[PDB]
């Protein structure tokens, strides 16, 4: 016990330089550097699974961003872990997994019952983001689990609108095949077809037609 505590305090001191710049805790680092072993030790030592760093990330956000599947599962099995924790900009772990295209975690968070329709501060859901970066796999998983397909962000943009706007051909087709409404316009009455045409995304324009 003395050995465990003394080590934690010693390691903590050597890592404070880093943590003072990021606002992270030892658990954040375990997640960021993918150390499943260290992650368990810290949680058993009483580490707060929901502590936030300078951008509002909890160790769960960190695990997703670093694709630390081990630490991720260790956090998911921890009942105190808030799966819907929000970064300062409103980003949840599921939104991060979709936007960063981290494999496996989109399905895991959904299965673990994370709020599938949560949106960041710009009104964008995990589905909005998956569409924007053409993470077609996440788009299909989200849709299979009934994510709101026609959800609109603060600019009234639907995921289909973003896929058209950002040139995500595969994601656009996936949304259309799942009956996303292509007639829902943004705050400027622009159709997904309009923004695609304006940006010369002819392939997506044909798709919408
Ligand atoms: Mg899995």
UniProtKB/Swiss-Prot annotation:
Observed effect of gene inactivation: RNAi-mediated knockdown in the larval brain neuroblasts abolishes the expression of pnt, induces the ectopic expression of erm, results in the ectopic expression of Ase in type II neuroblasts (NBs) and their premature loss. Simultaneous RNAi-mediated knockdown of pnt partially restores normal neuroblast numbers and inhibits ectopic erm expression.
Source taxon at top rank: Eukaryota
Localisation: Cell membrane; Endosome; Endosome, Multivesicular body
ANK repeats: 22-51, 55-85, 89-118, 122-151, 155-184, 188-209
Post-translational modifications reported in the UniProt record: Upon binding its ligands such as Delta or Serrate, it is cleaved (S2 cleavage) in its extracellular domain, close to the transmembrane domain. S2 cleavage is probably mediated by Kuz. It is then cleaved (S3 cleavage) downstream of its transmembrane domain, releasing it from the cell membrane. S3 cleavage requires Psn.
Subunit structure: Homomer. Interacts with Su(H) when activated. Interacts with Dx via its ANK repeats. Interacts with Delta via the EGF repeats and the Delta EGF repeats. Interacts with Nedd4 and Su(dx). Interacts with O-fut1; the interaction glycosylates N and transports N to early endosomes. Interacts with Akap200; the interaction stabilizes N/Notch protein levels by preventing Cbl-mediated ubiquitination and subsequent lysosomal degradation of N/Notch.
Described purpose of this protein according to its UniProt entry: Essential signaling protein which has a major role in many developmental processes. Functions as a receptor for membrane-bound ligands Delta and Serrate to regulate cell-fate determination. Upon ligand activation, and releasing from the cell membrane, the Notch intracellular domain (NICD) forms a transcriptional activator complex with Su(H) (Suppressor of hairless) and activates genes of the E(spl) complex.
Domain notes: Crystal structure of the ANK repeat domain shows that there are 7 repeats and the stabilizing C-terminal repeat enhances the protein stability by extending the ankyrin domain.
Family: Belongs to the NOTCH family.
Name of this chain's protein: Neurogenic locus Notch protein
